[PDB]
């Protein structure tokens, strides 16, 4: 509360972090469904389904750019990847089971660099 704070947890190097965790998932082989944008004139169903699309482009560009207040809002825009991916495709697809291997990997980095 005011003038009441726990301890300073370093933030400093979230940055430099997010980065490397988006470079391997940017690298991982099943990452191709998430690379880009969905092109919202080819794909039907997607443009009115899916409230708020994600890709790891995008997320690239919004962390390169500041627009990133804290490591919590980096990790929902992830999420939002892989809760979309779901929302739109099969659990018994190559899509579906590419954004479940996704997020388990990226649960995995998240844990280890920062709980």
């Keep these: 509360s005011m003038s009441v704070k ?4 370093d933030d400093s190097k979230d940055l430099a972090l997010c980065s490397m965790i988006l470079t391997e998932m940017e690298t991982h082989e099943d990452a ?4 880009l944008p969905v092109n919202l004139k080819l794909v039907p169903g997607y443009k009115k389904v899916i409230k708020k699309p994600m890709d790891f482009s995008t997320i690239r560009e919004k962390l390169s750019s500041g627009q990133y207040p804290n ?8 999420r939002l990847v892989f809760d979309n991916c779901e929302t739109f495709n ?3 697809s190559d899509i579906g089971r590419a954004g479940h291997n996704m997020r388990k990997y990226f649960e995995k980095k998240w844990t280890d660099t920062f709980k």
């Design 71 to 78: 490591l919590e809002t980096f990790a929902l825009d992830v």
């Design 90 to 92: 099969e659990d018994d």
């Design 32 to 35: 191709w469904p998430f690379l």
């Design 6 to 9: 726990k301890p300073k947890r």
